[PDB]
Design a protein around this ligand. Structure first.
Ligand SMILES: [Mg+2]
Lengths: 195, 48, 50, 50
């Protein structure tokens, strides 16, 4: 009867609402289609108060809440986007990854292919703020499970066969990056104070 | 009124007290004085 | 009794759209000390140039 | 001029004091006095007037 929305755009919208972000580096077809039909996607998503913010420089899309410009509701609330607060370890790990990504961008430029970081590099850095939980096996398992948890949010790729990881471009658009820097520096200073 | 040291002479003629605020590193201090107390302070600067 | 019957899906609920904005970070208490210090800064005496 | 100044304080509320604490660069407590007839706030560029 009525016209049906194109198959590719339907696939794009469903995938984008499932994972929360596309990437040209891992889904070139779908990413290309959405940028060629920005009005169509933004129209499909507008009724839900959802909207896509496009980052051409890093070749990344992500779903963001659309709600109106600074109404009496200073902080947005949305039935679907359930806000979450990461636990301490996740926050510190995200701060470390944020710092690494920013540092690499400072050298290779914005949007440069992220250098692969070895798992071994991260363990000493977490040990600064968490000490040694008791064994190398325990700490490595903790790091692996934390990276698996973060992969859900799309911040990092899964460890490869050589036990390295990559930092997804999404980490640049976190909610409030000032929170990471302040907390990280605060603990980094407290450890020196107490030692 | 607020002025960054402009047309002060005009302020003298239509206001009775001034708040002198100065910067020092990352901390700013504020003082409240009358025009005549500041005039006396200048007269102390007048020895130079 | 862990087979999966071919019954349809109804009431399919869409929630948890993982918008990156939705995240928040850990709040850590700082119980070091609380500041009485309320010195009146009487040192605000003028120190200004010509 | 004070003949017109009789309106101030008589009919309407007038600002007379502002008290700060750890607001901007004003570490610690502070306070400034406002004369009922009018005040002028002066200082070098970028010191804390605004
Ligand atoms: Mg200003």
């Amino acid at each position: 009867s009525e016209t049906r929305t194109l198959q590719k755009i339907r696939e794009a919208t469903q995938e984008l609402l499932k994972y929360g972000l596309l990437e040209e580096a891992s889904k070139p077809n779908l990413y290309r289609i959405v940028l060629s039909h920005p009005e169509e996607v933004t129209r499909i998503l507008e009724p839900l108060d959802l909207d896509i913010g496009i980052d051409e420089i890093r070749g990344l899309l992500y779903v963001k809440v659309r709600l109106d410009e600074t109404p009496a509701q200073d902080e947005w609330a949305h039935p679907l986007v359930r806000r979450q607060r990461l636990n301490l370890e996740q926050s510190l790990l995200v701060a470390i990854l944020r710092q690494h990504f920013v540092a690499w961008e400072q050298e290779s430029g914005t949007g440069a292919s992220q250098a692969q970081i070895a798992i071994d590099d991260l363990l000493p850095q977490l040990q600064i703020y968490l000490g040694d939980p008791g064994s190398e096996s325990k700490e490595r398992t903790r790091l692996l499970t934390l990276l698996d948890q973060l992969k859900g949010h799309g911040l990092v790729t899964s460890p490869d066969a050589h036990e390295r990881i990559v930092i997804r471009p999404i980490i640049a658009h976190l909610a409030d990056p000032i929170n990471l820097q302040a907390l990280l520096a605060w603990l980094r200073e407290q450890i020196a104070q107490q030692t | 009124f607020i002025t960054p040291n402009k047309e002060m002479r005009l302020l003298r003629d239509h206001t009775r007290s001034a708040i002198v605020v100065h910067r020092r590193g990352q901390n700013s201090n504020m003082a409240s004085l009358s025009w005549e107390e500041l005039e006396r302070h200048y007269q102390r600067r007048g020895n130079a | 009794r862990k087979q999966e019957v071919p019954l349809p899906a109804v009431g399919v609920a869409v929630t948890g759209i993982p918008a990156i904005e939705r995240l928040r970070f850990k709040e850590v208490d700082d119980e070091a000390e609380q500041t009485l210090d309320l010195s009146n800064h009487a040192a605000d005496l003028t120190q200004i140039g010509d | 001029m004070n003949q017109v100044s009789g309106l101030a304080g008589k009919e309407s509320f007038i600002l007379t004091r502002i008290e700060l604490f750890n607001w901007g660069g004003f570490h610690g407590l502070h306070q400034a006095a406002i004369h009922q007839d009018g005040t002028a706030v002066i200082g070098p560029t970028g010191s804390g007037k605004t």
